[PDB]
Amino acid sequence: NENSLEIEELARFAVDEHNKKENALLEFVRVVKAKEQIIDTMYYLTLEAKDGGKKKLYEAKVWVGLNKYNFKELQEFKPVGDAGGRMDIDPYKEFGATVELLSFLPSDFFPSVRDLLDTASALYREALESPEHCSPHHTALRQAILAWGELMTLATWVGNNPASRDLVVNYVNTNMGLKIRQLLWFHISCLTFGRETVLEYLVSFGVWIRTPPAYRPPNAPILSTL
Amino acid sequence: NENSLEIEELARFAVDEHNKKENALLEFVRVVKAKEQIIDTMYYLTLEAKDGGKKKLYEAKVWVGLNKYNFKELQEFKPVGDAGGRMDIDPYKEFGATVELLSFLPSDFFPSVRDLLDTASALYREALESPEHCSPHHTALRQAILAWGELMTLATWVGNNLDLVVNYVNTNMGLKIRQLLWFHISCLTFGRETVLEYLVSFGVWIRTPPAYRPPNAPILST
Amino acid sequence: NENSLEIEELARFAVDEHNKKENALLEFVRVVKAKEQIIDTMYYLTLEAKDGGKKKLYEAKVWVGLNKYNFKELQEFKPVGDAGGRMDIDPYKEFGATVELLSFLPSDFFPSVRDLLDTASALYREALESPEHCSPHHTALRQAILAWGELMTLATWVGNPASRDLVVNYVNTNMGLKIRQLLWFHISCLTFGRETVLEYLVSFGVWIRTPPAYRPPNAPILSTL
Amino acid sequence: NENSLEIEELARFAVDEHNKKENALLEFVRVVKAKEQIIDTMYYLTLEAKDGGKKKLYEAKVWVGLNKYNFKELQEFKPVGDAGGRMDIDPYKEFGATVELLSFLPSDFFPSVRDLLDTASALYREALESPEHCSPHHTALRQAILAWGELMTLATWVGNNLDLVVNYVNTNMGLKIRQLLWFHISCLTFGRETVLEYLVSFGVWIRTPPAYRPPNAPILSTL
Amino acid sequence: NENSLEIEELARFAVDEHNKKENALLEFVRVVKAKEQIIDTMYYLTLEAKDGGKKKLYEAKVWVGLNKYNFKELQEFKPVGDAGGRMDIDPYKEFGATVELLSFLPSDFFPSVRDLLDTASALYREALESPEHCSPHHTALRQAILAWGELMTLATWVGNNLDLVVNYVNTNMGLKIRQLLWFHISCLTFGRETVLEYLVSFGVWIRTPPAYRPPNAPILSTL
Amino acid sequence: NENSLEIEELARFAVDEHNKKENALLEFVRVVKAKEQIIDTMYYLTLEAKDGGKKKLYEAKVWVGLNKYNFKELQEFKPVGDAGGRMDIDPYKEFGATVELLSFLPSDFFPSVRDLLDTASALYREALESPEHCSPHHTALRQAILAWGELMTLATWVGNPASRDLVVNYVNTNMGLKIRQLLWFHISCLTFGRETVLEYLVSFGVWIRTPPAYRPPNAPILSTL
C-alpha cells in the first residue's frame, strides 16, 4: 500500500542493505511512488535519500505476514538522472574558447534572448534553415535555438497547468536563459566578426573590466566592422 | 504597493491599451510582479493575460491621490521568451534525415537516455571532450548532452523547491533527446548512410504484416 | 406533381415507348424527381428503371384535364453519362502489371492504409511535393493519395444511427482495399524497382495458387537484393 | 456484450487515460464497434471521442469481479484515417498549375462529369486503354476516371441499403473530379501552355467589372 | 495649463508674428497640442491657423506677471507635413506610362483590391517574397502591397477606438492602390508594351460615341 | 431591415453554420450593413464576427411571415480579400537587409519625415523625376514618397473634436515611423553605398544590444570614407 509502513520497511531494509554492502550512507525518509504488481509480487518503489544531506531520486526493485516473512532481496539500484557530470563537456572547448574565458564578460552583459534570436534570424536565417552544415557555429546554433524552443514549451506547459508555480517559470527565464544567452552571443558573434576577433575581444574586454573604475577608459571595447 | 488594487487597474489599463493599439484581444487574469521606480512614477509591470486557452506572461512598461490622477501611458507590451515559432530548423537536415524519418520508427524503439549516455561516454568520451571539430556528429552530440544536463539540473531544482514535471521531461523532451542521441551515436558508429538506410528499412519492416516480412527485426551491428 | 399517378403513367409509357423504339428489356418502379417547365409541360423525369433488374436511373424529358388528354412522346431518356465504365481502364496496365496479376494477393498482404501513407510520406515526401514528375509512379501516387483524402473527407462528413456507421465501414474496407493495392504497388515499385515487383507478383501467384499441403509453409518476401 | 455498462466504463477510462498521456479535451459519446476476446480478456474497442464539437473515429485497447480486479492497460489512441494534413500534395503542381490558379475559373465553369467523360472516351479511349505511358496527363487521367468509377459504385451501393449522400458525391466530391478531368482533357487537347494562358486570361475576364467585360467569355480553340 | 487664456493670447501673438514675418492671412482658431516646460519657460505650442477656409496643422514656439514681463520670442511657423507639392513624382513615368495615360481607363474599370491581391498572391507570391530584384515591377509591386497593408491596419485601428473614415480609405485611397496594382500585375503578366498599347486601345474604345463602339470592350489576353 | 432581430438571427445562424461546416472558432455581435435583393431575398450580410476575438468583417450572402419560416443556408461568407497579409513581404529583403536588421535602431535615430523628404528632394530630385529607373532604390523611394503623400491627403481630409486630432497623431507617428525607416534606408543606401549601410546596421545592432554600462558612450556614425 502507498500509506502503509510496509513499503517504508521494504526500502529501509534496502537502505541498510546499501550501507552494509557498498559502504554507503543514505537517509531514506519517505516514498513518493511505490508500484505494486503481482506475478510473489514485483514491487517497484523509488527511494529518496540524503547523500550527506543532499537528496537524490533512486529506484528500488525488490523481488519479495505472507508479504513480510518471504524471500527478500533487491536486485537493481538504478538512479534517476545520468546528467551528473559523467562527461565534462565544454560548450566552447572547440572553437577556441573555454567557459571561464566567457566569464570575462559580466553576467548582465549579454543581450536578451529575443534580441539575439532577432539577430540570428536577421543575418543567418537562410543558412540556419538549410540542408547543409555550413560551419560548426551553425551546427551549434541550430541546437541552441531548438534547446531554447523546448525550454519555452516546458515554460508554457508549467504556466498553463500549485498556484505559485510562476517561480519555476522565473527560474527557467533567468538561470538557463543566461547559458543560452552566452551560447547564442558567442556563435552569432563568431559568425559575424570572425573567430579570432571574438577570442581577442574577450581578452581585451577582460583587461577593461579588470581595472578599477578610477582608471578605466570610458569607452569599452566593442565588436564592430567600421 | 505589491498586491494593491491600483496595480490591478494598471494591468487592466495596460492590457486594454495593448488591445486597442497592437490589435489583439488579451484577457488579463493576474499580476506576478510590480517594480516601483520613482523619477511621476515609472512603473514596471509583468502580467499574465489569457489568450485563447493559453495563459502566457507579458512584460509591461507604464509611466504614471497623485498616482491615479495622472497621465498613464503604455510604452511596451513585449512577451517573455522569443519562441513564437519564427525559425523552422530541423535538428536533422544538415545530415540527411528529417524529423519525420525519425518518427517513422516506433516511439519505444529508441533506447532510454541513460543507456545512450552510457553508450556515448563509453565510446567517444575522448573526442566529445577534446578541442576538435572531428565531425558534425560530435558537434551536435555535445550540445545534445549539455542540453540534457541543463534539463536534468532543472528537474533536480524543481524537486528541491516549491512531481508531474519530472516525468513530463522524460516523456516529451526525453523522447526527442533519445532520438537525437540515438541518431548521432549510431551515425558515428555505423556511418551516416547506413543509419539513413536502416531507418527506412526498419520502418517498412514494422509496417508489413508479420507473415510476409523477414521474421527477425533488423539490427545494425558489426 | 411528385407522388401523383400522372408522373408514374408518364414514366410507364416512357419505358414502354423505349421498349417499342430501341428494343431493350425494361421495367419501372419509381420516379425520384420530376421538375416541370411549362411553355406543354417540359418535364424532367428522373425515373429509376431497370435495364437488367437493377435500380439505375433514367433522366427523361417529355412534352405534355388537358394534362392527361394531350400528346405524349419521348425525345430524351438518357442516363447519367458513364453508367458503369463505358471505357475499360486498367490501373496497372501502363506499369507492366494488370489487375489479374494483383488479384492473387490476399486481403491482408497489404499494410493498413495509414501505414502505406506514412511510408509514402516518410520515404518520398520531398519527391511527391516537388513540381517535377520524376516518374509515372509518383504521378499515380499523388493522385492515389488525393483520392483517398477526398474519400476520407466524405467519411468525416457522413459522421457529421448505424447506417452512417456501416457507410464508414464500407468506405474504409471495400474501397480502401483498392487504395491499399494501389499504394502498395506504387511505393513498392519505387522502393524495389519495377521488374522486381512484377517477378515477385508472378512467384507469389505461384505460391498462393498451390494448395496448402504442397507449398513451402511461408510466403515469398519482397526485397531487392 | 456490446451495449452494457462495462464497456462504457472501459471506454471512459480509456478516454481519461488518453487525457493523461496526450493531455487534450476528447469527449467520449458512444462505442462504435466492440470485440470481446478471451486470452485475461482482450478487447478491440472502437470508441468515438468527440473533440470540442467535431467528431472523428478513434480506437482503444484496454486489456482487463475477476475481470475487474486486474490491470487495465491502454496501449493506443490511434486515429482511423491519415487525413490529418500530414502531406500537402497539389494535383496540378507537377503540371505547371496550382489550385490557386484553378480558382480563377469559378465553380460552375466546369462541364458536367458526363460531358467530360465522353470527351475523354471519344478522343483518347485508345490511348487511355493502352499499355504504355504516352504522357503524364494520361497517367493522371486514368486515375481520375477510375476514382470517379469508385465514387459511382459507392453511390449505387448506398442506393441499395439503408438518401442524400448520393448527391453529396456528385456535387461536392464530383467538383474536384470535374476540375481534374477538365484540366487533363484540355491539356491533352490544346497543349499545356495554352491551358495555363487560358487560366490567366479567364482570370482577367472574370476579374473585370461587368460594365467593361466583353460578352464573349474566353474559350479554348485550335482552328 | 492647456485650455486657459494665456496660451490663447500666446498663440494669437504667434500668428500675428507669422503675419509680420511671412505676411499672409492665417486665422488662428484653436490650440491643438500644448506642452509647458520650465527652463524662463519653454512651450511646444501646436496651434491651428486656418488659411482662408482651408485647415492645416501648424506650429509655434514662443519662449516667454513674471512670465509675462519677459521677451516673448517666436522662432518658427513650420508646417506638419511636406505635401506642399515640393516634388512631382509620377509613379508610372519610369515604366513608360503617365497618369494622363491611365485616365483613359475610367475609375470603375479597375478590379477590386481583393481580386488584384489574390492574382498577385496566386501568380507571383514566390518572387514577391524572394530576396532578389527580378524586375522594377516587382520592386514597385511589393511597396504597393505593403502600403495597402498599412492602410488596412489604420482601418482596423480606427475601427477600435473613437465611423466613415474606414470607407474613405477603401474607396478614395484604395483607388490609386487599385491603379498601381492593376498596372504592375498586368505589366508582369502581359508585358509592358502590351499594357501601353492596351491603354491606347481602351482610350480609342471609351472615346467613341455609343452608337459605333463595339460591345466587346478590349481586354488583355495572351492565348 | 437593419436593426431588426431577423438580420441578427440570420448572422447568428450564419456563424453557427460556419462552425458546423468549416470548423473554426467564431462568435458574433453586430451586422453593420445588410442590403437586400428580392427575386427569396439575396441578402448582403456584412456582419462583423470574431475569429480570434477581434472585430473583423464577414461579408455573407443568404437565400431566404414567410421570411422567418423558409430555407436558410449559406453559399457565401467570405471576408475582404487580404485579411492580414496573406503574403508575407519584407520591404528590405530584396535590398540585402530585413526588418529584423532595422528593428534595432531606436525611434529617434531617424530625422523627421520632412527632413528625410527634403533630403530626398534636394539631393536626388533630378533622378527621382526622370523617366529612367537608374536603381531599385529610386523605385522604392518614388513609391515611398507617393505613399506618404497619399497618407498626408488623408491627414488633411480628416481635419476637413479630439477624435480626428488623435487620428492625425496616429497617422503621423505610428505609420510614418515606417515611412521614416524606409526613407532613411533608401536615401542612405544611395548616399553611402549599400554594403556600407548594411555594415552600419550590423555594428549599430551590436552597439544598441549592449547594456549602457559596457559600451562606448556614443553611437556609431554613418559616413562612407
Numbering used by the authors:
A (entry chain D): 14 to 52, 59 to 83, 89 to 185, 194 to 258
B (entry chain C): 14 to 52, 59 to 83, 89 to 186, 198 to 257
C (entry chain B), F (entry chain B): 14 to 52, 59 to 83, 89 to 184, 194 to 258
D (entry chain A), E (entry chain A): 14 to 52, 59 to 83, 89 to 186, 198 to 258
Please share text taken word for word from the publication where this structure appeared.
The dimeric assembly results in the formation of 4 helix bundles (spikes) which project from the particle surface and a sequence at the tips of the spikes comprises the major immunodominant region (MIR). The VLPs effectively bound SUMO-tagged Junín virus glycoprotein, gp1 as assessed by structural and serological analyses.
N-VelcroVax VLP samples were vitrified for cryo-EM data collection. This confirmed two different sizes of icosahedral particles. Reconstructions of each particle stack with icosahedral symmetry imposed revealed that these corresponded to T = 3 and T = 4 configurations, as expected. Interestingly, both reconstructions (resolved to ∼3.5 Å and ∼ 3.3 Å, respectively) showed continuous densities located between the four-helix bundles on the surface of the VLPs. Processing of cryo-EM data yielded density maps for T = 3 and T = 4 VLPs resolved to 3.0 Å and 3.5 Å, respectively. Initial inspection of density maps revealed no additional density attributable to bound SUMO-gp1, although there appeared to be a subtle change in the orientations of the Affimers, with these being closer together in the N-VelcroVax:SUMO-gp1 complex map compared to the unliganded N-VelcroVax map. However, for N-VelcroVax, in which Affimers are attached at the N-terminus and spatially constrained between the four-helix bundles, Affimer density was resolved. This suggests that the Affimers in the N-VelcroVax system are more rigidly constrained in their position compared to when presented at the MIR region.
